[PDB]
Structure formats: structure tokens, C-alpha cells
Amino acid sequence: SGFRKMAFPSGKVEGCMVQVTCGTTTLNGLWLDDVVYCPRHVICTSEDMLNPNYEDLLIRKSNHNFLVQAGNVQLRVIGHSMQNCVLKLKVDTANPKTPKYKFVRIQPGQTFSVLACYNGSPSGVYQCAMRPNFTIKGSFLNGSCGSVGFNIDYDCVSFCYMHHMELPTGVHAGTDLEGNFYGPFVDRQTAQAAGTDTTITVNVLAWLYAAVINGDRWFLNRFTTTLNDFNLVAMKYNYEPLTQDHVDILGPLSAQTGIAVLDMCASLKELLQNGMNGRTILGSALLEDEFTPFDVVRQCSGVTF
Amino acid sequence: SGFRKMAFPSGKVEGCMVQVTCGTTTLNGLWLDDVVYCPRHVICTSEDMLNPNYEDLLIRKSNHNFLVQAGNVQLRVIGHSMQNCVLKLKVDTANPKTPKYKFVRIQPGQTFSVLACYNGSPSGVYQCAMRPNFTIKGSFLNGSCGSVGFNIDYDCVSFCYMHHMELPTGVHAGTDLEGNFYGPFVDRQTAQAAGTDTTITVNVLAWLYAAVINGDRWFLNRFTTTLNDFNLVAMKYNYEPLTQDHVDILGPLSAQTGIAVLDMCASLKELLQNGMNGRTILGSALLEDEFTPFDVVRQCSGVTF
Ligand SMILES: CSc1ccc(N(Cc2cc(Cl)cs2)C(=O)Cc2cncc3ccccc23)cc1
Ligand SMILES: CSc1ccc(N(Cc2cc(Cl)cs2)C(=O)Cc2cncc3ccccc23)cc1
């Protein structure tokens, strides 16, 4: 028993991290097969970031302007292209530690592990959710750019995030591994802001199910609700709409605990209206929304990799 | 910027995890050089667990009663000894993935990473503190026994914890890698209980310094305190005493932020008196006590491995 914010073991991804330097700019790259993926802003100075023309900045660069260090080994760049906001450096050596992997674009509410790196070296691993406003609440200092987010399914690494930017509120923005930004952000140093965030309703319900599995049930009640009546209340508290697809996704947790999804919704409705009344759930005074239904089943049933 | 509960990258430890079976009992072992370390209760049935004599249970076993699996490879056991509550299985082949490592015993308040494993396969990694009552608030199902806790300094893995047991409150107990229990716990299914836990005061102070470094000072005040007046107040909230050694350990964070340790203590005193009044500190509605002063500097300055 017990419930922790739990990252995927980072070993398969640690074997893929490299350092990329272009002029005075150093950041992290992801080395898979014979390609290194990094943020295209590696080709910018701080001055260039104000109004960069990436096409123009890139065409002035040759293969040998890009220094890739795997750890102690210099990789030779033999080619480069831009895909959206990521630079692809073709290198002379395929990564022997290349795991089974795909590139996936995740939806808001989905969680992943971040391996925070500096100079191609990992400093640590933590769990993040893609917020409904397409930001993540990460821990990233300057030099963390090119750090990646991922899930592991059996032996297959699903890379979903590459780190590009910190917004003024101290939250973080980046791309999928095809270089498409999550959220309405651009890789220029211009005024940009996180939108008003909302609570990931399906995740709060998953976490209430986690609480029940772990022996906390004070918040359960004898009431039920329609999906529609639930959403009419939850919307007022800046909670994301709960869909029938969310309800279906919560099926396994509902079956395991014997609490119907709409009954857990009735519990959450009451919690939003009344607060906790000085009580806590799984050691939190707040309703936690950064655990998916899958995160709860995976942790509460011990699935391995 | 940002501050997250961050685990060490788990790769070096993932390479050391194996499955150990003795009869009907399967758990996790740590394979370093040509020895596999596991909880000595691998040689027990559930029936044996009330009052086992491990010397007597062990002498009745041959090398070939121990099945050690490193993924798909059967390791041959060519010897065994017991050191306190750990079994050391000598095997025919040294682990080629053996990292630079040592065995360390940590103090209460010190943090480490846990790689939760089942059947010798890692399921995930999270950050834990050795509680003042010598338990950890982990996430462990049956089969997690032999999962290890560790710190990384550069390339050197310091193994500090092996998982043995869940107590009735759903908290966890185990040993150092020399098989000496943290706390008064014994590897028998006898009635045992976590003692009254306390808050790790020096860690809460480190985390308030983390909040300041990350741009939040709403909780500061104009006041100071004597160490002794601080301890007289904090004790009433079930906080561990703050020692002069704790004050010294906080020196670097105090110098970085320009906030005197005793001034931060005055802030904590007020936070205990007032609560948050619907605010948060680094995204928490509670005072976090599972970051050491070292954890804060490491994360806020971007140390790599
Ligand atoms: C090549 S030069 C360069 C200079 C600054 C940054 N920026 C600003 C911007 C990035 C984007 Cl994309 C648009 S503006 C960052 O946001 C980078 C950073 C990331 N994560 C954490 C950060 C923490 C502190 C400072 C910068 C951080 C990027 C590259
Ligand atoms: C050989 S058979 C065997 C059967 C049960 C357990 N126990 C009970 C005890 C351990 C100790 Cl040491 C003394 S009693 C555990 O606590 C094992 C477990 C661990 N961590 C999390 C657990 C969660 C649920 C159930 C058991 C868990 C040990 C060996």
C-alpha cells in the first residue's frame, strides 16, 4: 500500500541523452538511431531569440558548427534538417543503447516522466501532467532545454515532450518530438503567458479511487448524480468537463473498489461545495489532478517494465 | 525555475535488479559483483514468519534451492551467508553492469530514491525520507521486498535501504545493505507499530528557502527568534528539535537568499500558527519535510550524474 508521485525508471532514456553545442549555446539532445533531436533555438544567441529567422540562421551553418558529445565520445554531424521547432542532426554513429521507442503527442491531463538534464547529463526524474493550458509545472534551470518527457509501455519508450521554455509565471512549455508546440507558444523571446488553467476532473476522480484503495473513504456519500448535473456544478469550480469516455476510462477503478463512477462524482461534487473541513486525502490538503486513471491502476497493481 | 520531488536517475540501479525464488517465495535481489543481496525472509513461508529461526531455516537449504533470474539468464548460486537480516547469495558470474557503489546507513531526515521492483523488474522510482520514527512513507505491494533505496554522488551509487515490510498503518520498514533494521523493527510477523512520527524541521526550513529561491516570500515576517524559543514552539506542533548542526547545514541556503536561519525559523513559527490561509508554497497546502538542505541546493543549482 501507499501512494507516491512515481516516475518511470529512467535507464532507457539516460542512454539517449547527449550535449549539443552551436557557438556559445549548449543544451541537451536525444540520440536515437543515427539522429540527435534538440530544440532548433540551439542555433540562436540570446540576441537572436528576440526575433529569429530560423531558416536564415540555419542556412548559414554547416555540419561542423554542431558539436555533439554523447558523454566522453564526440559524435560527428553528417547532416541537419529542421522539423517544426526541433533540429535533427544526422550523426556518423547509431546509438547502440537506442531503446524500442515511438514519438507520441499526448492530450491535456496525460502524465509523463521528465529526465531533467544539463550538458547531456541527467540531474533527476519527476512526474508531470500536461495541464489543460498546455503548460507543465516542471523543475528546469537554464541549460535544461532538450530534456525529454516519456512514458514506458512494456519495453517501448513513448517520447512525448521536449523542453524549450519557461514562461514568466515559472511554468514550462515545449514540443512533441516532431517539434510541434503544446499550446499557443512560439520559440521567440516575446511577451507570452500561460492561459487560465483548469483542474483535470478525470484525474481527481482517479486519485479519489487511489485514496479508497489505500483505505481513506471519509469523503464517500450515499448520493448519486447524472454526468450532466455533475458537470454543471464542477464547471463553476474551473473543473474540465467529464465526458462519457472519462467515465469509461474509470471503469477498471470503479470495478476494483465497488464505487460507481457517478457515485464518486457525487462525492467530488460534495467536496467542491463543502471543502475538506480540515481533513486530508492521501496526505494532501488539496484535490490532486496529476494522476491519470492508468497511473493509479499501474501503481496500485504493480505492473513492471 | 520550479521545484519538484525529484528522484535520482535509476539506470545504474536498474542494471542490478534480479528475481530471487526460494520454494514458493519470490522477491527482488541486488546483484553487485558476484553477490546477490536480498531479505533473509526469502527462506520463509507465510507460516514461518511468526517466529522464524533463520540460522535453522538457512542450514537446511542447498545452493540449488535458490533460483536467481537476471531477466532471461539463470545465475547459478555457488554459496550463501547471512549478515543480520540480509541473505548474500554468491553466484558464478559477476554483474557486468555493476556500478561504482558503497553501502551507507542514513540518519532520520535523510532522503533517498526507491526503485520499486516486482519479479526483479522495476515498476517506478520515487523520493523518500527516513522518517524520525525510522519508517518510510513508500508505495510497495507484496513482491516489492528487496527493492532498494539509494543516493547518487557523481557515478557512485550509495545503497542505504532494502525493503522488508509494511506496518499496519501502511508505512514501510527495512534495513541498510548490511541487513541492520532502521528502527526497532524485526523480520517476524509479530504485532509491531510505527512510533509517533514527527516533522523533519531542518527539511521544512530547507523547503522554505527553496520557495524563496523560486521567487515566493509571502510567508516571511519582520521577526526573529532564539533557537531555544523556536524549539519550545515547534515541539508543540510535533516538530523535531532544530540543533546548531541543523542551523550550520542551512548556512549555504541562508547566505544565497540573505535570510538568517533564525529569521526563517520565525517565518516557520508564524506558518504553524496561521496556516496558509488558502495560499500554497511550491504548489503544496502543507509544510513539506522530505527535502534536505542538500536536495534544495542540488535541484536549485542543477547538479548532474
Ligand atoms: C538560445 S538562448 C536562449 C535563451 C532563453 C531561452 N528561454 C527563453 C525562450 C525560449 C523560447 Cl522557446 C522562447 S523565449 C527559455 O525559456 C529557456 C529556459 C528553459 N527552461 C528553464 C529556464 C530557466 C531560466 C532561464 C531560461 C530557461 C531559450 C534559449
Ligand atoms: C516470506 S512471505 C512474506 C509475507 C509477508 C511479508 N510481510 C510481513 C512481514 C515482513 C516482515 Cl520483515 C516481518 S512480517 C510484508 O510486509 C511484505 C510486504 C512488504 N511491503 C509491502 C507489502 C504490502 C502488502 C503486503 C505485504 C507487503 C513478508 C514475507
Side-chain angles (χ1 to χ4, degrees):
Chain A
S1 97
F3 202 74
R4 274 272 189 206
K5 196 150 283 182
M6 198 175 285
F8 293 99
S10 55
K12 297 189 164 163
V13 173
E14 290 171 57
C16 299
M17 297 317 294
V18 301
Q19 193 185 240
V20 181
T21 133
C22 193
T24 50
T25 311
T26 297
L27 44 66
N28 308 279
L30 183 70
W31 181 25
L32 303 171
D33 311 289
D34 60 345
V35 176
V36 173
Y37 305 81
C38 74
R40 68 171 174 178
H41 71 59
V42 70
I43 72 180
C44 298
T45 66
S46 37
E47 253 226 274
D48 286 315
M49 288 301 301
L50 273 329
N51 203 221
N53 179 322
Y54 283 103
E55 193 160 343
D56 191 67
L57 266 25
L58 185 54
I59 207 172
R60 307 226 236 165
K61 302 238 172 271
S62 27
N63 291 340
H64 66 267
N65 294 148
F66 297 105
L67 311 174
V68 184
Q69 272 279 338
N72 218 222
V73 182
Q74 218 241 359
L75 303 187
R76 202 165 61 85
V77 177
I78 63 159
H80 60 262
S81 55
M82 190 162 285
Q83 184 182 11
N84 308 116
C85 297
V86 301
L87 207 189
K88 304 198 281 195
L89 303 175
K90 192 181 191 60
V91 288
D92 63 340
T93 37
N95 190 357
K97 295 168 166 185
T98 298
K100 199 162 318 193
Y101 80 90
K102 34 171 156 95
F103 292 168
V104 63
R105 184 171 180 87
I106 55 162
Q107 235 74 267
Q110 298 190 310
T111 56
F112 53 93
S113 294
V114 168
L115 183 66
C117 297
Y118 302 89
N119 301 115
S121 296
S123 61
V125 67
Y126 53 89
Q127 197 69 356
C128 277
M130 185 59 63
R131 302 300 317 168
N133 70 357
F134 289 107
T135 69
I136 70 168
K137 296 197 220 291
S139 168
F140 289 119
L141 306 164
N142 190 42
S144 62
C145 303
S147 297
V148 297
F150 61 96
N151 290 276
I152 311 192
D153 350 78
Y154 295 102
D155 64 337
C156 184
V157 183
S158 285
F159 294 100
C160 60
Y161 182 82
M162 182 168 269
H163 184 52
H164 286 67
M165 111 166 53
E166 178 165 307
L167 291 164
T169 51
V171 300
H172 301 105
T175 68
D176 61 27
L177 265 299
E178 291 164 271
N180 307 112
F181 259 96
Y182 294 101
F185 309 107
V186 301
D187 51 354
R188 350 219 221 95
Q189 185 55 253
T190 195
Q192 329 194 39
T196 292
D197 203 22
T198 54
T199 302
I200 308 153
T201 311
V202 65
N203 286 8
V204 172
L205 287 170
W207 174 79
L208 290 179
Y209 278 111
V212 162
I213 292 165
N214 273 280
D216 232 342
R217 13 212 319 147
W218 64 260
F219 48 81
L220 263 257
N221 67 28
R222 284 295 126 176
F223 308 126
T224 200
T225 184
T226 62
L227 189 142
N228 187 257
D229 284 355
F230 171 76
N231 283 320
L232 286 173
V233 176
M235 197 224 140
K236 305 181 172 164
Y237 294 94
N238 254 19
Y239 271 58
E240 282 292 294
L242 194 74
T243 309
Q244 186 52 38
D245 279 358
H246 295 145
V247 170
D248 296 341
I249 284 175
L250 288 167
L253 287 167
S254 73
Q256 189 190 326
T257 55
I259 313 302
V261 180
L262 290 182
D263 290 353
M264 195 61 85
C265 289
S267 180
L268 180 50
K269 184 193 292 170
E270 181 183 45
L271 277 165
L272 290 175
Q273 282 165 356
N274 295 329
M276 313 262 289
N277 221 48
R279 290 180 279 203
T280 176
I281 303 179
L282 285 181
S284 183
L286 299 174
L287 303 179
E288 249 300 323
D289 78 341
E290 292 216 354
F291 299 94
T292 69
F294 173 80
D295 292 357
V296 176
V297 169
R298 160 202 142 214
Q299 174 162 178
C300 292
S301 77
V303 188
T304 53
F305 314 99
Chain B
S1 102
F3 199 78
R4 270 270 215 226
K5 198 91 59 136
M6 199 172 283
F8 292 100
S10 55
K12 297 198 144 143
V13 174
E14 291 171 53
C16 299
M17 297 316 294
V18 301
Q19 192 185 237
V20 181
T21 309
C22 195
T24 50
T25 313
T26 296
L27 45 67
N28 308 281
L30 183 71
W31 181 26
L32 303 171
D33 303 312
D34 58 348
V35 15
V36 174
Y37 306 81
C38 73
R40 67 171 175 177
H41 69 60
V42 70
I43 73 182
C44 298
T45 66
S46 55
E47 256 259 1
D48 286 315
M49 285 305 304
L50 259 313
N51 290 279
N53 186 298
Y54 285 101
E55 193 201 8
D56 192 72
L57 285 169
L58 185 56
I59 206 170
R60 304 177 183 265
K61 300 243 174 265
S62 323
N63 289 163
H64 67 267
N65 297 151
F66 298 106
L67 313 174
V68 183
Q69 277 228 260
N72 217 299
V73 184
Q74 238 244 266
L75 301 189
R76 204 206 342 286
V77 176
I78 61 160
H80 57 85
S81 54
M82 189 161 290
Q83 184 182 5
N84 305 302
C85 299
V86 300
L87 200 54
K88 305 198 277 196
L89 300 176
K90 190 78 130 190
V91 287
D92 62 341
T93 39
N95 190 357
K97 295 173 177 187
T98 299
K100 266 195 53 206
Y101 77 90
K102 36 223 273 302
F103 293 165
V104 305
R105 186 168 180 84
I106 55 165
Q107 308 292 338
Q110 297 190 312
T111 55
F112 55 91
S113 292
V114 168
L115 182 64
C117 298
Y118 303 88
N119 303 301
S121 295
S123 60
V125 67
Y126 53 90
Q127 198 68 356
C128 269
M130 183 57 64
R131 302 301 315 170
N133 70 355
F134 288 107
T135 69
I136 70 168
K137 293 180 206 153
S139 174
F140 289 118
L141 308 166
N142 191 41
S144 62
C145 301
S147 297
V148 296
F150 61 96
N151 290 276
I152 310 194
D153 191 12
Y154 185 46
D155 64 342
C156 182
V157 183
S158 287
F159 294 100
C160 61
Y161 181 82
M162 183 167 267
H163 185 50
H164 285 68
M165 107 175 41
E166 177 163 303
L167 292 164
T169 50
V171 300
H172 301 104
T175 68
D176 62 28
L177 267 295
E178 292 181 317
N180 288 132
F181 258 97
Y182 292 101
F185 306 107
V186 296
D187 50 356
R188 322 168 22 212
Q189 193 99 250
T190 199
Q192 328 183 44
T196 289
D197 203 22
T198 55
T199 301
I200 306 153
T201 310
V202 63
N203 287 7
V204 174
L205 288 169
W207 174 78
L208 286 184
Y209 278 111
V212 169
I213 290 167
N214 271 274
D216 203 3
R217 12 200 306 154
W218 65 260
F219 46 81
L220 293 197
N221 70 22
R222 76 168 173 94
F223 290 122
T224 198
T225 186
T226 63
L227 218 215
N228 203 249
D229 282 350
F230 174 75
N231 283 134
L232 286 172
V233 169
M235 248 80 129
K236 310 178 167 168
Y237 296 94
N238 259 61
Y239 271 56
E240 280 294 293
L242 198 71
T243 63
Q244 184 53 218
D245 276 356
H246 298 331
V247 172
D248 294 342
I249 286 296
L250 288 166
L253 287 167
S254 181
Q256 190 183 331
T257 56
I259 310 173
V261 179
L262 289 181
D263 290 355
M264 195 61 84
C265 287
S267 180
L268 176 49
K269 291 168 66 173
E270 181 169 293
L271 276 166
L272 290 165
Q273 167 195 100
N274 294 161
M276 304 221 164
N277 185 23
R279 289 178 281 204
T280 61
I281 304 184
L282 292 173
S284 184
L286 296 176
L287 303 175
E288 247 299 324
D289 80 339
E290 296 215 352
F291 302 91
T292 69
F294 173 80
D295 290 349
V296 173
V297 168
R298 159 204 145 210
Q299 176 168 174
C300 290
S301 226
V303 172
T304 53
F305 308 102

